[PDB]
Amino acid sequence: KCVKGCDVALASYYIIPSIQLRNISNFMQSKIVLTNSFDVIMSYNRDVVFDKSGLISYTRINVPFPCECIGGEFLGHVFEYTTKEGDDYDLIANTYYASLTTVELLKKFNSYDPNHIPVKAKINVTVICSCGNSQISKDYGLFVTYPLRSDDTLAKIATKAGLDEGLIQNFNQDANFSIGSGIVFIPGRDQNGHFFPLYSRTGI
Numbered sequence: 001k002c003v004k005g006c007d008v009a010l011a012s013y014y015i016i017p018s019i020q021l022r023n024i025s026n027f028m029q030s031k032i033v034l035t036n037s038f039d040v041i042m043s044y045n046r047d048v049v050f051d052k053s054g055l056i057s058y059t060r061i062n063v064p065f066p067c068e069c070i071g072g073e074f075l076g077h078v079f080e081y082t083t084k085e086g087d088d089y090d091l092i093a094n095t096y097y098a099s100l101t102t103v104e105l106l107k108k109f110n111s112y113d114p115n116h117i118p119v120k121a122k123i124n125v126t127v128i129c130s131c132g133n134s135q136i137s138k139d140y141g142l143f144v145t146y147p148l149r150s151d152d153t154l155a156k157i158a159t160k161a162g163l164d165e166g167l168i169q170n171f172n173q174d175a176n177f178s179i180g181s182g183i184v185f186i187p188g189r190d191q192n193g194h195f196f197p198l199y200s201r202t203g204i
Ligand SMILES: *[C@@H]1O[C@H](CO)[C@@H](O[C@@H]2O[C@H](CO)[C@@H](O[C@@H]3O[C@H](CO)[C@@H](O)[C@H](O)[C@@H]3O)[C@H](O)[C@H]2NC(C)=O)[C@H](O)[C@H]1NC(C)=O
Pocket: 018, 020, 022, 023
């Protein structure tokens, strides 16, 4: 249950061949990610290296998005995607949105026949998020929505994040980080590389 969300969450977007920033920007348009979003997206990815093509296949980039309370029930954000010929919920969930949504969420929040979705149709694409949990730690107020994949492990995730494995597990107590699917929440760094805390400790 929720009443309010938070201004920013990060979506861990796993890059496959044929996906570049222009596609990610199109899929992830929001009040934060506008038509010309390169600087805003890349400001949360100052660690990321490009190759001659742009984004390197099979790496991740963190995409900022607003985190709303949906129906007083759960935290997430509804993106909008317009279908093209051949699209189905599998392609939308697991290719375009890189498993940041699920076929179940696409069925739940769209009126289309889930087995025959039309072309040039607007799709509500729900991506969950977190604004933290003071019972785990007060030190983190920005979270990455991180869909696990076949080669992920807790050890690699924790090392890359610069955080203790036990803390990451504590934020996701029921998750098996080696299971190869499902979403976990990882504390995220701001544009300066610092962990934005749950409660502000900067002077006004
Ligand atoms: C990622 O973004 C790029 C740039 O928008 C997409 O490439 C573009 O794909 C479209 C069709 O999906 C190409 O369409 C054109 O098609 C019309 C019919 O719609 C036809 O008259 C032409 O044959 C033409 O190819 C478009 O040229 C192409 N633009 C590029 C490559 O600069 C790409 O599809 C996106 N990837 C996704 C959505 O997965």
